[PDB]
Design a protein around this ligand. Sequence first.
Ligand SMILES: [Cl-]
Ligand SMILES: [Cl-]
Ligand SMILES: [Cl-]
Ligand SMILES: [Mg+2]
Ligand SMILES: [Mg+2]
Ligand SMILES: [Mg+2]
Ligand SMILES: [Mg+2]
Ligand SMILES: [Mg+2]
Ligand SMILES: [Mg+2]
Ligand SMILES: [Mg+2]
Ligand SMILES: [Mg+2]
Ligand SMILES: [Mg+2]
Ligand SMILES: [Mg+2]
Ligand SMILES: [Mg+2]
Ligand SMILES: [Mg+2]
Ligand code: NA
Ligand code: NA
Ligand code: NA
Ligand code: NA
Ligand code: NA
Ligand code: NA
Ligand code: NA
Ligand code: NA
Ligand code: NA
Ligand code: NA
Ligand code: NA
Ligand code: NA
Ligand code: NA
Ligand code: NA
Ligand code: NA
Ligand code: NA
Ligand code: NA
Ligand code: NA
Ligand code: NA
Ligand SMILES: [Sr+2]
Ligand SMILES: [Sr+2]
Ligand SMILES: [Sr+2]
Ligand SMILES: [Sr+2]
Ligand SMILES: [Sr+2]
Ligand SMILES: [Sr+2]
Ligand SMILES: [Sr+2]
Ligand SMILES: [Sr+2]
Ligand SMILES: [Sr+2]
Ligand SMILES: [Sr+2]
Ligand SMILES: [Sr+2]
Ligand SMILES: [Sr+2]
Ligand SMILES: [Sr+2]
Ligand SMILES: [Sr+2]
Ligand SMILES: [Sr+2]
Ligand SMILES: [Sr+2]
Ligand SMILES: [Sr+2]
Lengths: 119, 246, 145, 115
Amino acid sequence: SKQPDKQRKSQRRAPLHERHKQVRATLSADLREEYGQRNVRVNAGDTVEVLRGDFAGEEGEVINVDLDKAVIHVEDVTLEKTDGEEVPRPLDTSNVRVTDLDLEDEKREARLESEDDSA
Amino acid sequence: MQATIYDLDGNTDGEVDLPDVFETPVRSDLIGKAVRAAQANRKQDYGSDEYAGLRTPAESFGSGRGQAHVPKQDGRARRVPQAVKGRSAHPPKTEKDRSLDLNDKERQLAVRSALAATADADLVADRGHEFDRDEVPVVVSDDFEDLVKTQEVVSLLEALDVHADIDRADETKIKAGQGSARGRKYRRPASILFVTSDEPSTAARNLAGADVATASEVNTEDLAPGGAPGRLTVFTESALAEVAER
Amino acid sequence: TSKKKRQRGSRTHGGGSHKNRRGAGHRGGRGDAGRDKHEFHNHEPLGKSGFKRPQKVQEEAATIDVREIDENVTLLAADDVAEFRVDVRDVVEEADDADYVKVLGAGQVRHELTLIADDFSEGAREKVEGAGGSVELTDLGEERQ
Amino acid sequence: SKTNPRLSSLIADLKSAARSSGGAVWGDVAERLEKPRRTHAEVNLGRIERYAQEDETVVVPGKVLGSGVLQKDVTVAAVDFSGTAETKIDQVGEAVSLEQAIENNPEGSHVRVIR
RNA sequence: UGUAUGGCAAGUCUAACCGGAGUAUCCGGGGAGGCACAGGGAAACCGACAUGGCCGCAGGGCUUGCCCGAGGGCCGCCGU
RNA sequence: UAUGCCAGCUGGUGGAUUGCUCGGCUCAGGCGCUGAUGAAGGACGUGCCAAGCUGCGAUAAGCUGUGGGGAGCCGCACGGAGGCGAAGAACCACAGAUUUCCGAAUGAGAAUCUCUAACAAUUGCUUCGCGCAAUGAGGAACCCCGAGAACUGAAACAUCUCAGUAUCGGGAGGAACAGAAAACGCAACGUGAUGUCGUUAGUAACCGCGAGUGAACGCGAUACAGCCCAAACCGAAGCCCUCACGGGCAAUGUGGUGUCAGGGCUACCUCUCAUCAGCCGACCGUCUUCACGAAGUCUCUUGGAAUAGAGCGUGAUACAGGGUGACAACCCCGUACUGAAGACCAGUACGCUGUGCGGUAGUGCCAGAGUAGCGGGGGUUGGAUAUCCCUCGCGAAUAACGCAGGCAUCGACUGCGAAGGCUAAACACAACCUGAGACCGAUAGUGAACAAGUAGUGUGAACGAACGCUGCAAAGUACCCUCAGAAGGGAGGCGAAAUAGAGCAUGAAAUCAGUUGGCGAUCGAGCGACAGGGCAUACAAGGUCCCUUGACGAAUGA
Ligand SMILES: [Cl-]
Ligand SMILES: [Cl-]
Ligand SMILES: [Cl-]
Ligand SMILES: [Mg+2]
Ligand SMILES: [Mg+2]
Ligand SMILES: [Mg+2]
Ligand SMILES: [Mg+2]
Ligand SMILES: [Mg+2]
Ligand SMILES: [Mg+2]
Ligand SMILES: [Mg+2]
Ligand SMILES: [Mg+2]
Ligand SMILES: [Mg+2]
Ligand SMILES: [Mg+2]
Ligand SMILES: [Mg+2]
Ligand SMILES: [Mg+2]
Ligand code: NA
Ligand code: NA
Ligand code: NA
Ligand code: NA
Ligand code: NA
Ligand code: NA
Ligand code: NA
Ligand code: NA
Ligand code: NA
Ligand code: NA
Ligand code: NA
Ligand code: NA
Ligand code: NA
Ligand code: NA
Ligand code: NA
Ligand code: NA
Ligand code: NA
Ligand code: NA
Ligand code: NA
Ligand SMILES: [Sr+2]
Ligand SMILES: [Sr+2]
Ligand SMILES: [Sr+2]
Ligand SMILES: [Sr+2]
Ligand SMILES: [Sr+2]
Ligand SMILES: [Sr+2]
Ligand SMILES: [Sr+2]
Ligand SMILES: [Sr+2]
Ligand SMILES: [Sr+2]
Ligand SMILES: [Sr+2]
Ligand SMILES: [Sr+2]
Ligand SMILES: [Sr+2]
Ligand SMILES: [Sr+2]
Ligand SMILES: [Sr+2]
Ligand SMILES: [Sr+2]
Ligand SMILES: [Sr+2]
Ligand SMILES: [Sr+2]
């Protein structure tokens, strides 16, 4: 509704399909002009650019999209552990922008180029 | 007195007489009473559970075990106001009348007095509104209600030198206290009131702090928000006329 | 700053000793209790007084003074103007749920009036007859013999 | 504490007229206005007709109501008048606000106080 | 039942509820009924001074003690 | 100076304070029955590793189908291993499959098991066969019918009060109950079923006339709605089961007619649009859910991080709210506008189908009995002689008669037909759903923000807690040394921050250790107030203080 308690509640206790909207990010100039949207649900094949973190101004491929925790893994956006291993740093999608898309799916390519529907 | 009418471009388009009710004495004492009686009337009834802390068969062991006569159950002190997990002594009640009655004439006269406080150019600047204009209130033609875009209303208010007010009421204060945890995190200054005649301005209502009204029901709160008189209102030619018989 | 507001830190709150503000003893009973004994003071005596007659056999009259009719003559020009002819039945408010309209004689009569009502007093008459006028009774006021 | 701001202004205006001028009534009226609303003058016309003289301003330290008849050409002055009083006064005289009478008679002369 | 304040004033207030709406706020309507406007009497029943006199505070007037004297006080008369 | 006292300092102990909110509390709208087709609840199971919880049921965190959805996924819960998914998975909406045992529990017995065909029990119908059916039990409260306290008040107490309250027995539904006058009785030339809200009114009425108890007619409002038998007069013209044949019912009367605008029979005027049965069956609204949806993530500084500040720019029928490494209308979900579905309203309204409304005269054909009413005893009510009820006794009229209109009898007048029946809507409740808040904010608020009716107490009925916070990101501390050691320690590593390192935001007081200043082993006790000396003190937030001398100079005063 409008109550802060019931707002965060819906965002946490959200069914898996409704967690799709929680992993949405803004589209580039070229892409907003082409598909008629402003944002898209980030996919594991997409390439993207970081706008807000310490890693702002770096590009990379989206390696994972965890709906459960509502965050994305991007290539080369790593953290060095104590044993020298480089583990990924979870990024928020609202801190990211899509440069290139993955249209490997016929249903996603159909949903984006249709003015009535939104992907 | 005379009221200068304006067109949608911001230039003069004739003039009509400013009604008698704008010569009603500004009585902040009656206005403030009519606002406090309006605010308290929409306040919700609260109250703690009637049986809270009482859901126990706790009993005191009299005089003998070297302890104070406090009702106990399993070594824990229950019920009594002084004991932890006990009842509230004089708690907030649901049976309470949080509503304030106000005589019809006193409310009507207060509207009139608030409506009149809109005519004095000094009071409007004393209330807080930032503007550059001698004539107050702003009087616009009935062709105002036809506007749909808010960005065009801005251009009308920029032309009328009365936009420095929406520049003022843009900034938001983040309230100190636990009001945050209940929905009321923000607060913003009250600004311009757009009084129309047929339907409230769907075109203005999104402007920073701006409230919208109609002359058949424009109340003391709209005219004087928070009991403070002199709101920078903008009437429609048919509103200025209809507001007279109030 | 209210009285109740300044009561914190006072312990007894204006109650004297902490041994005072307890139960019904500090009151002297409950409610109206002890009305004949220790609290006979400013109480009406024990007993019954008079009788009541059934409510539908009770007559409620419509009272109006000659002073009220006279003060408002210039304001009442919607009624007959003779050589003033006025039906009192159409002047008094609450004239629907009343038994009969009685004109009382209290005050002065500086004008000439022709009054039409159900019942008149000896004083209502003397003040209108001695000030140039007539008192005409209604067909319902015929219950006087 | 008087909640009204204009009763508080009237009192202040009555006070300056009692000092800066030769008034001995305006200060006496202001002394009754400072006193509670229950002690204020609630008077009808039937008293103004009995006790007032022509060419003598009638001063009321309260409100004038409209019960009774007024035939004299008196100029009444009060804090407030009832809508029927003012109709019955302007019919045979002049209902003037006490706030006018201070500018119109700062000396406070030829004036009767009725309550 | 007092008191302080405020609106209205020989009147004053609406209740439930209806309409409107910016939809618990709020604007219009609603005077049912309550209190006041005459009392005395168990009841039947009857039914009063918009002022007649004398003082006199405040205030006003005057030719600066003398006038007019609200409210007030002491009587009359009036209703039962 | 040992024991030691006061204050501080570093570090603990402790978890107050501040900040935060997955929970509560309250209000409001919507909605509202389940069960022998075995409910509700329970037990036991069910996962690769599975203890709790959630789900599920031997097909066991799931199987099918339609629509939505979509690149992800395999609950709470971030493991390891492995798997599923473009054959469209996860997730969601609707419909369905499966659904152990105990459980009303119903073949019989039983601490969730066992024993040799089961509606057990009680009823209805009946092919008289358990053949077809019914009841049983659950649900927060509300509702209806019964049973029915005492504390308490009366300043004791007994009638009275508390109070038809508590508690108990029975029963229904989404609401219940009530209901179309043998009425009201502002007595009228008047109102015209029933609930409910306002008022009438703390009135009338009652009462050790004490304490206290307390309507109604009317009025204004909400919502509206009005009918069906019994009998007369017809007399099998009728009903139920079955595909049918057939069977069952019924003259102890099925069905027709009829029901105070009394009806029927006999003789005529006219006519129906009433009424009952039955078909059709929404709009609008409301409530919940969904689709769609504008505008920056530009410049410099600080910063770990820009949601900050300054500069530029932008939409707005959208400046409610939340998210996001800090104060965001333009980053993300949303919000306005527009549109879609379901439920509810409602099998109602409207329309339609059939029926037939109504009037005149004639006729003593018909109109509900232990009733109306009286008397004794009880109880209850405001019911006073004049409330409603139970109980014992007695007991009537037949419309040409009867009841009533706050005492009885008689006559008048006025109103109305008991002892048969049905009845929509307007209100109660809050389980359920969504919303709201000058409520609370972790010793609060529910007992319950956590394993919550958990742990745990009692033979049992029953009783019952405490526990919230690492970080932006686990980057959740590699390697080395030490040690008996996955301990702990040291060095070291990550981070803006480890005195953020695991009950890990902040970190008060009591109190502990180490230590600093003062005091201190010849000295006396409300621990201090006011004066005045020793010693001690980084800055900041205070900057004054001493002496010669001199000016002024009260009371007083050599
Ligand atoms: Cl009487
Ligand atoms: Cl008067
Ligand atoms: Cl009636
Ligand atoms: Mg598209
Ligand atoms: Mg508590
Ligand atoms: Mg607790
Ligand atoms: Mg605080
Ligand atoms: Mg069995
Ligand atoms: Mg007692
Ligand atoms: Mg009794
Ligand atoms: Mg006694
Ligand atoms: Mg009783
Ligand atoms: Mg009655
Ligand atoms: Mg029939
Ligand atoms: Mg800590
Ligand atoms: Na409990
Ligand atoms: Na103790
Ligand atoms: Na309340
Ligand atoms: Na006490
Ligand atoms: Na009446
Ligand atoms: Na009235
Ligand atoms: Na429901
Ligand atoms: Na059965
Ligand atoms: Na488990
Ligand atoms: Na199931
Ligand atoms: Na059988
Ligand atoms: Na007692
Ligand atoms: Na006793
Ligand atoms: Na008694
Ligand atoms: Na963000
Ligand atoms: Na009774
Ligand atoms: Na009897
Ligand atoms: Na009757
Ligand atoms: Na706690
Ligand atoms: Sr999940
Ligand atoms: Sr999770
Ligand atoms: Sr003892
Ligand atoms: Sr006291
Ligand atoms: Sr006595
Ligand atoms: Sr009336
Ligand atoms: Sr009114
Ligand atoms: Sr007098
Ligand atoms: Sr049953
Ligand atoms: Sr009706
Ligand atoms: Sr009958
Ligand atoms: Sr009688
Ligand atoms: Sr605690
Ligand atoms: Sr025991
Ligand atoms: Sr270290
Ligand atoms: Sr001693
Ligand atoms: Sr000297």
